[PDB]
Structure formats: structure tokens, C-alpha cells
Write a protein that binds this ligand. Structure first.
Ligand SMILES: CCCCCCCCCCCCC/C=C/[C@H](O)[C@H](N)CO
Ligand SMILES: CCCCCCCCCCCCC/C=C/[C@H](O)[C@H](N)CO
Lengths: 235, 240, 249, 150, 60, 249
């Protein structure tokens, strides 16, 4: 026969290998495909879809629909945050279980910009301005609007547009961040504050809800496929 | 304001092909090489082919409603002695016969069905590299259905309760037959136990109609849930 | 102004960017001449109106199940072995400028719902196909402990989207938000989505419609109606025989 | 008996390759891993064993670490795994350059965290020279076979 | 199959061998290099750099 | 005569033959518009002068740590998540024709220093980042035995170059010798050296400066000052937010 020399790796089974193998059903007349709607070519397509953030994971709200609603009211202006969460899309509990977080938890590395949309669900008669801020990491997380306004931010007029989108641009020392809580690849902070205040006339609800959505931008990518911690099997 | 960045990152590893380009364990089939009269040793085992006996591949697949792919099956065979006081054994040979729906299921480890004149069979020698075969897309539909919102039967008026009743979400769209596994060797004086781990790799994958991933523990072949209905942890609204 | 047959309706989402269409000759599995009732069946039918309250958890319908009793569409559905249709779903919910609340309207292909029992896949046909009345989501899961006469019904939990997935991710499905401060209607155009060119309408529900309160209804003082108007589109039917009469209740 | 073992991937458990690498500050390379597997009996009075099969699963950072030799994680649906048969030539795999930086850092003159004023002593403290630039995951190794009498 | 004959050296692991092997992470989008200063192509470059001699190795 | 911004200085080594440069568009990781303070921060700052004595073992500084309190450069460093800069280091040490002695000035990328304890990598941030005052090498290694209140400081031994390598080989690093009989100054031009295009200045020190007495100072009778003047070059900053305030002491 042809002289051959078996190298290391011979006879192993690497689950990630890509080798040919014999067909157990030769000459099978495969049913041809049809043009089903909604074909998906890349998992990032799913990550680019806005999905609702469970922003309110309090004891009484977590694992209910209330966890998706953040309550604003028409009280007097303050500089204290409405909501706060870290830019760890795979490991921050508010973001981990979003579609983006679910996809990222199958990968070790992620990079790219993010889109955070906020939808105001108060009455048409309610007016107000909010400030939505991204602070890159390395400093104290914004405790008040005075600090938050120094970072990237957007002023949202709820009276004008019920929805506001803030793009958190990719800014990182590393070319990729890990999909775990990691100090070296920490992604920064996201906060919301009252810019002026929510104002309502009489005979109007004085408390309303906003909803948060997160998605990946077109520059987003992931690497190093891995098993997720979000599913387990017992026994 | 932003600067000019010549982006180089690609999405090569997030293509649906790459996302499923892994062998995933879908079953652990236990068989025994032992005297036929022990009555505790299973001389052959029949496993209905499915991805729902495990969860990881199931969750990944159920990210989507419809799929179409060829399949690569890799069989990893391990064996061990069960006692030390009955001598030794010679290297075992295993038969893994694919029984498509309708073909006779073996009733005994050595009945006629193992002739496998028309069933594909793989004979694996213990210690050889894990056996491997490939199958094309064999769905009777134009795609596999991960979710089927319907019934195989519609009950009709005038039929008794027992008639027309079928499981919700159960259709023959996923009836792919079974694998029958035996040890071809006649028994040694000592009992041997083997496990065949079946690893499934979708290839040339196409998927349609993405879905939110499973968030609570799987409970049965359907979408039912009973336990672990509180996946979200507690976190303050204004806690970074 | 959207007109189909004799029906007219006076924000819009085409599911997967695919308008409903007839079976191409290159995708047709059955060989018999299809029935295409066109306007007589491809028209808007208005379902029974439901009531949105502060305590409402959500509503769900199945298509074509919700239209099974809608005139000639229902007749053609029950007279044929095979049926195919897209849909135009028009959810109508108006309120005052002083009301607040938001609805997520999701069209879900193969909207399988979780059962109410330890027995897997045990929801019986009658409960899985409620018709135009549809069903409602629940706040929590209640296991049915009646062994003699099991309810054998769905127990779809709202935050699990009735199928063990977080409701916040249901936006991956084709959807529209009705935000009372912005709009009073949602229009979803659903192509026929299935792993086959055509299927049994009575056995199989191609689409589910889930309406969840994303923001609870509120009013300074309250209940407001929600009305579904659904037109089947590009209807095709095959396999004519005696009429199917499904068992009920 | 340790039915499975988890080893964090690093070149610093031994010295020779470490010294050669640390001739330089930054490196960029693909890696070839070769696994040489040896086994032996521990006693003579409990019979014999059949040829063992070993699972070597790469667990990238964030993936669930196995807690038991036969827990769900060994399904390895997304983790690369190599199944090695005893007596076969040593297993071998290759990996490209996987650094999240543009090069591996053999020396990192810094911290993962900067402590901030007003934080207690316990907070903001990280090891000097420790960064996730070298967090490459782990290898989880088990014997797939069920146990023999010995 | 193609008739083959395994020669001596088959199944060995020579630590100095240069063979192909399967990639455990296929389709990985490698981070591209940057032009870091002070690249070294050959160890002799280091040997050509003057370094101080410990000429006085007395006890003290 | 070397001029940067408003500063002027009146033998020279470009580390790795690479002049400092700005990030190319093809190497830029962050996407936000960088801040380039140019002259306001890219200027010579003079550190506190140290004293070379017969008994001196050596001195060390970290960059950008040594400049963290240098006017607008320090402000930009602490106001931004990401920072990048090369340097021009000018060591100044004059003496008479009747003095003798030699200094080795080494610029070391990633100048990690050995600790003082059996606990690995235990040097705390405050001691690892002394600022403009820098630190000094020691003649020998003294293990810190205080368990209650460990010093958690570097113990850099001179002949081990503070990191377990023979000092004689430190010339592989970019370097200059100040031989009192020949010259009174050393100029090292350091490009930004890192495994990333840009990094966190507060977390990470890209360069270390080590000044070792290769030949002890002597005079026929003595102490002479050594003054470091460092100009950051091609400064870029990204990720503006509230100011970082590192914990001290
Ligand atoms: C030598 C005989 C053994 C080898 C032949 C194995 C037969 C495999 C044929 C059945 C094909 C199953 C394909 C996968 C089934 C999954 O449930 C669907 N793909 C789900 O999408
Ligand atoms: C089948 C699974 C096992 C095979 C996969 C092994 C995974 C290896 C991925 C990690 C890559 C490590 C590369 C080397 C790390 C060193 O610390 C750096 N190169 C130092 O310069």
C-alpha cells in the first residue's frame, strides 16, 4: 500500500471537527426546500432585534411582568437616578436574559455598539424631559445627574417622542469584552435621571411606566462559541 | 461625536452553521453483554431518535421554529467489567442498527431482525475511534418542525372520549425511527456493561422564524413547565 | 384604508417582510385543483370584543382556529382536507388622551402553549382550539390536581409567554405595540408560515396571536374594549369531501 | 478518587516554556495542544479494566464548570471536546490566536481594578499584574467509562 | 479504501514534529495585529545587543 | 534644543526606532471622537528631584503614573476611561570633571516589579502607583513578615532589576548611559508600547523608568541631584465621564 504515517490526533473524536463520513442512507431523494418566511443566516440577526429589559428586578417584581416596567411619577425634580445598570450585556442580570444576553451567553467574546431604546407609556397629556447617560468605566458610577451628564448622554422629551434611542458606542481598551462579569473588560454604566420632571394636568394618572429595550448594532460581533449557564439538566 | 474606524471584525463564528457546528450528546444508550438468563442485563437497547432527551442542543435548536440540515452521528462506546471474580472478556463488537419507522423492532438480542438486510447497521469494534455516519435531510416536510401547534388527529362529533384523542404538539413530522444497539459477541463468564453515547451535529443548517430561548427548565417533549419558574434574580432598580 | 372583499378598515407590520402569496407551481404538493374562494372568504371578520382592565394579564387566539366559524371561510376550512391562508390582523383599542397603557401584539408561528398538568402534552383538542373567544394568560402557574376529571387545558403564564420563555423576548416575533398615548390600532400582515406548502387547518394552527399588557391600563378615576378584526388572505383549499365536524366541549 | 479534574489553561505551571516565552513582553501565535495520556492500575486484587475513553472538554470563560463527573455539562453541545481512546496516539488540536487584545501580554504592569476614594479596603483590591488578558478558560478531564471493580 | 501501509514512526508523538491538526475553534474571527514597536524575528537579534558582563565574581 | 508646547530643553535614544505616533484609523478600537489636548498636555513636566549618593541603589518611576498629577495631562488622564501617550524622558545629572560615576537609564515596557511578601502579586494599588516620587531599588530582598498589617509594597532588588532578572541584561531594554566624565543628560523617546491601541491609564502603566548606578558616585572629598523631565507625546484620550478619584495611601 501507499506508505503512510499516522500523526498525533489520529483516532480522536473532536466534537468541533469537520470531516467527511459515510452516508447511512445513500441515494435518498431529499424533500426540496420551500421559501419559508423569516429565514435566519446569523445569530447576530437575533441579537439586533430589540427585546424588553427586565429593568425592575425587585423582590416583589422579579419573575413577573412588573419587572419590565419602571415607574415614573410627577413629583418635584431631583437629581437621583430613575434606574441604573452596568454595561455587561451577558452577565448583568437585567441584560443577561434579554435576547441579546441569551445569544451572548453562548459566546465568550463580544464587541460592538448597543442600542438602548426607552418607551414612555404614560398618558398623552404627560410631559417631561429625561436624561439617559452612558458613563465609560474607571470612575465612580454616576450617583446623580451632575456626574451622569459628564458622560455620553441624550435628552429625551417624552412629550415630543414616546420613544428615545441611545446608542452606547463601542469604547473598550480590549478589542473584545468577556461575556462574564470582569473588571478588566467592564463596560461602564447606564443611568436615567429626570431632566426637568414629569408634568401632568389634572384628571391624569400621576404615575406611569417606561419600558426598556436593548439590541445590538450592525457593528456587533461575538466569538468563541461556548455552552451557556442558562440551561441545565438534573439527573 | 465618533471617529473613523476601519472595522475588521466579522460574524463568521455566529453564522447558523457555526452556531450548530458541534457534536452534542443526545443520548446515552446502556447495553449489557451477559448470559441471557440473568434477567437483569439488557442484552439490547432501543432508543427512539430525538434531540429532546438532553437540553443543550434542544435549547439551541429551539432558538428557531423550523430547521433543515443534514445530520452527523458520532457514537462513543465505553465499557467496563461489573465484577472481578468471573474471568475476563475478549474485545466486544457492537451492532447499532437504524430501524426506520415501520421496520420490525428487535424483540431479542439475537432475533432475525439483526440480519439488517435493509436497515443500515454500523458494526463498531471496541477501542476503535468512535463510529460515525451521516444522514441527509430526511424530513417528510420541507423542514423539520421544532414546534407543532396542532394535533395528529381531529376528534369528530359522535366519537367517544377515547377516540380522536392525540397528544398536543405531537406529529409524525419528527418520527425518525430508532436505534437498536446490541453486543454481537456471545457472553463471557463475567458480565460487561457498555454505554453508547450518541452525539449529533447538524450540518448545512438553515433555520426559520427565530423564537425566544427556553428560560425555565424543560419538562417533557413539549413546551410544558412545572418547576424553576423564577429564573430572574433579585437586583435593585438603581443598583449598578 | 385597507379593503378586502366587501370589508373595509380605516403602525403596520409585514411579518418577516413577506406578503402573503399563493402556492407557486414549483412548491405545490397536492395535485388536485385548489379552491380559491377569494373575496367570499378573504375578508375581514370581527371577533368578539374582549375587555382590557387594570388586572388583565393578556389574551391569545389561534389562527385559523379563531376564524373556524366565520362564514364561508369556516365552511371552506371544514369542507377541505387541506387549507392555506395568510392573515391581516387588526387590533383596535382606543382610549382618551387621559388614559395610559400599552399592549404588545405578537404574531407567533407555531404558538405552542404549556399545559396545566404533570402529564406532558395533555391539553385536549377542545381546549387547544377555543375558537373566536380565544384564551387568556395567567399571572402564575396553577397545576391541575384533579385526577378524576382533569381540566386538560393550557396554563399560559404571561411573563413566560405561555411557553416557558421570557415575555420580554417575545419581540423577536413579528409584533406591534399599541401605546395608548400614540396609537389606537395595530396591523400585522402574516404570510402563511409552515414547514409545508399547505396543511390541515383543523389539525394545525399556523399562527398564534398574543396580546399582553406591557404597561397596565390606568385612568385618573376603568376598562376599555379590544377588538380583533382578521382577514384571511391568499386562501387556498384542497381535498374536498364531506364536512368535518370537530368534537366540541 | 477525583473522577474529573479542571485545569485552568496557562503556561505558568511549568518553567521551561514560561522562561522562553518571557524572553519577550508581547507574543502572538496559534497554539497546538498535544495530550499524552497514561494510565495504571492502583491495586492487583480487584480484577481488570476495559480500555478507557477520556473526555477533554474546553470550557471557555463563562461556560458552566462541571460539578460532577457525569453532570449535564459534559454534553458539550457548544464546548469543544476531544474524546481520546487509550492506546491511541496522543490527541492533538490547534487553536488560532484567541487573545482579546492584539497580542498576548506576558507582563501586565497594572491592575484589573482601580480602587476609588471612599471605597472600603476590601473593595477595589485586585492582584498586581492580573488581567483578563490571559483568561483562556479551562480544560475539564474525565474518564467516560463507568468504573471497573478496580 | 485506498491501499495504505503504515510505516515505522506511525502513532508516535515527536515534540519537534510539524503536522496539521484539527482546529478546536473553527471560524474564529482572530483579532488582527497592530504595529507594536520592537518586534523580534530572530533570537540572534537579542544576542547582538550589548549586555553588561559580571566580570568580578568574587565572594564579596 | 527640544521644544514641546510651551516647554523647551537645551545621547538621544528612540526606543525600538519608533517615534511616538497617533492611532491610525486602521488600528482604532474605540469609536468615540478622541480628545487630543496637544500642547496643553503634551509638554515637559519636571518631577521632584532625587539625590544620588554613594549609597544610592537606584530609582524607579511608572508612566503614566508619574505624571498623574501634572496639570492638564493629569486632568485628561483622570477624566477619560482610555488614554494613550508616548513620552520624552530627559534625565538631568551634572557634576564636575572631578566627579565620577555612571547611571543606566532604562525604559522598560510593562515594568512589573517583585513584591515583598510570600503572597503572590500582593502589592496594592497605592504602592504600585507612587506618582512622581517614584520608588527606589534595594540592595537585598527583605521579606515582609508583618501578618496583621502587611506593607504590600514592592521589594525591587537592584541586581535582579527588581523583577528577578540580572541587571546586566537590562540593556536589552531601550536605555542610555549617563557617564559623568562624558555626558550630563539622557534623552529617551518612548513610543506607546502595549498589546492594545489604547488602554486605561489609571489601571495600566505602559512604561517603567529605572535608573541604576552602574558605577557608584565618587568625589575626591558627596551627593548630586538627578532631575527627570518627562513630556507626554501624541496624547489621545477616549471615554469622557466624571473624574476618576483613585484611593490613596
Ligand atoms: C447504521 C445505522 C445508524 C445510523 C443511521 C441513523 C439514522 C438517523 C436517521 C434519522 C434522522 C434524524 C435527524 C434529526 C432529528 C431531529 O429531531 C430533527 N432534525 C429536529 O430538527
Ligand atoms: C477539544 C477541547 C480542548 C482543545 C481546546 C483547547 C482550548 C485552548 C484555548 C485557549 C488558548 C490558550 C493559548 C495560550 C495561552 C497562553 O497563556 C498565551 N498564549 C501566553 O502568551
Amino acid at each position: 500500500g501507499l506508505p503512510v504515517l499516522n500523526t498525533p490526533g489520529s483516532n480522536q473524536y473532536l466534537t468541533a471537527d469537520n470531516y467527511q463520513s459515510p452516508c447511512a442512507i445513500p441515494e435518498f431523494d431529499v424533500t426540496p426546500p420551500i421559501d419559508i418566511p423569516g429565514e435566519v443566516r446569523n445569530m447576530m440577526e437575533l441579537a439586533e432585534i430589540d427585546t424588553m429589559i427586565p429593568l425592575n428586578l425587585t423582590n416583589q417584581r422579579k419573575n413577573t411582568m412588573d419587572m419590565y416596567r419602571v415607574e415614573l411619577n410627577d413629583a418635584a425634580h431631583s437629581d437621583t437616578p430613575i434606574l441604573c445598570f452596568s454595561l455587561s450585556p451577558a452577565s448583568d442580570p437585567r441584560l443577561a436574559h434579554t435576547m441579546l444576553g441569551e445569544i451572548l451567553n453562548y459566546y465568550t467574546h463580544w464587541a460592538g455598539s448597543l442600542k438602548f431604546t426607552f418607551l414612555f407609556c404614560g398618558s398623552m397629556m404627560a410631559t417631561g424631559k429625561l436624561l439617559v447617560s452612558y458613563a465609560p468605566p474607571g470612575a465612580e458610577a454616576p450617583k446623580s445627574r451632575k456626574e451622569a451628564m459628564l458622560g455620553t448622554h441624550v435628552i429625551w422629551d417624552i412629550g415630543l417622542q414616546s420613544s428615545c434611542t441611545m446608542v452606547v458606542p463601542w469604547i473598550s481598551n480590549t478589542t473584545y469584552r468577556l461575556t462574564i462579569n470582569d473588571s478588566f473588560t467592564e463596560g461602564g454604566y447606564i443611568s436615567m435621571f429626570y431632566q426637568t420632571r414629569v408634568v401632568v394636568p389634572l384628571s391624569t394618572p400621576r404615575k406611569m411606566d417606561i419600558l426598556g429595550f436593548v439590541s445590538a448594532c450592525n457593528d456587533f460581533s461575538v466569538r468563541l462559541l461556548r455552552d451557556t449557564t442558562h440551561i441545565s439538566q438534573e439527573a | 461625536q465618533t471617529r473613523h474606524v476601519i472595522q475588521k471584525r466579522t460574524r463568521s463564528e455566529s453564522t447558523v452553521e457555526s452556531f450548530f457546528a458541534r457534536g452534542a450528546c443526545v443520548a446515552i444508550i446502556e447495553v449489557d453483554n451477559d448470559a441471557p438468563t440473568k434477567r437483569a442485563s439488557k442484552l439490547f437497547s432501543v432508543w427512539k431518535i430525538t434531540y429532546k432527551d438532553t437540553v443543550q442542543l434542544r435549547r439551541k435548536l429551539e432558538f428557531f421554529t423550523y430547521s433543515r440540515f443534514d445530520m452527523e452521528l458520532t457514537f462513543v462506546v465505553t465499557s467496563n467489567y461489573t465484577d472481578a471474580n468471573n474471568g475476563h472478556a475478549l474485545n466486544q463488537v457492537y451492532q447499532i442498527m437504524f430501524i426506520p419507522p415501520g421496520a420490525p423492532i428487535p424483540g431479542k438480542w439475537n432475533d432475525y431482525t439483526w440480519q439488517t438486510s435493509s436497515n443500515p447497521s454500523v458494526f463498531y469494534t471496541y477501542g476503535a475511534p468512535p463510529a460515525r455516519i451521516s444522514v441527509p435531510y430526511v424530513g417528510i416536510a420541507n423542514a423539520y418542525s421544532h414546534f407543532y401547534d396542532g394535533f395528529a388527529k381531529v376528534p369528530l362529533a359522535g366519537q367517544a372520549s377515547t377516540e380522536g384523542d392525540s397528544l398536543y404538539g405531537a406529529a409524525s413530522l419528527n418520527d425518525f425511527g430508532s436505534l437498536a444497539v446490541r453486543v454481537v459477541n456471545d457472553h463471557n463468564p463475567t458480565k460487561l456493561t457498555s454505554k453508547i453515547r450518541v452525539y449529533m451535529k447538524p450540518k448545512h443548517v438553515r433555520v426559520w422564524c427565530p423564537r425566544p430561548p427556553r428560560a425555565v427548565p424543560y419538562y417533557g417533549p413539549g413546551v410544558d413547565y412545572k418547576d424553576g419558574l423564577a429564573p430572574l434574580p433579585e437586583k435593585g432598580l438603581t443598583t449598578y | 384604508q385597507l379593503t378586502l372583499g366587501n370589508s373595509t378598515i380605516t403602525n403596520s407590520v409585514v411579518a418577516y417582510g413577506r406578503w402573503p402569496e399563493y402556492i407557486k407551481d414549483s412548491e405545490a404538493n397536492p395535485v388536485d385543483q385548489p379552491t380559491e374562494p377569494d373575496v367570499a372568504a378573504c375578508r375581514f371578520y370581527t371577533l368578539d370584543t374582549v375587555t382590557w382592565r387594570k388586572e388583565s394579564r393578556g389574551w391569545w387566539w389561534k389562527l385559523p382556529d379563531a376564524l373556524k366559524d366565520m362564514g364561508l371561510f369556516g365552511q371552506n376550512m371544514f369542507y377541505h382536507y387541506l387549507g392555506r391562508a395568510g392573515y391581516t390582523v387588526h387590533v383596535q383599542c382606543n382610549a382618551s388622551k387621559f388614559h395610559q397603557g400599552a399592549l404588545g401584539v405578537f404574531a407567533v408561528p407555531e404558538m405552542c402553549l404549556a399545559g396545566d398538568s404533570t402529564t406532558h402534552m395533555f391539553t385536549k383538542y377542545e381546549n387547544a382550539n377555543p375558537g373566536e373567544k380565544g384564551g387568556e394568560f395567567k399571572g402564575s402557574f396553577t397545576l391541575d390536581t384533579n385526577a378524576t376529571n382533569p381540566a386538560r387545558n393550557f396554563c399560559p403564564v404571561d411573563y413566560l409567554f405561555g411557553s416557558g420563555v421570557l415575555a420580554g423576548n417575545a419581540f423577536v416575533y413579528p409584533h406591534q405595540i399599541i401605546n395608548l398615548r400614540t396609537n389606537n390600532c395595530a396591523t400585522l400582515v402574516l404570510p402563511y408560515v409552515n414547514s409545508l406548502s399547505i396543511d390541515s387547518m383543523t389539525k394545525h394552527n399556523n399562527w398564534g396571536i398574543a396580546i399582553l399588557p406591557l404597561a397596565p391600563l390606568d385612568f385618573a378615576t376603568t376598562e376599555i374594549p379590544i377588538t380583533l378584526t382578521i382577514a384571511p388572505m391568499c386562501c387556498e383549499f384542497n381535498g374536498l369531501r364531506n364536512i368535518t365536524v370537530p368534537r366540541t366541549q
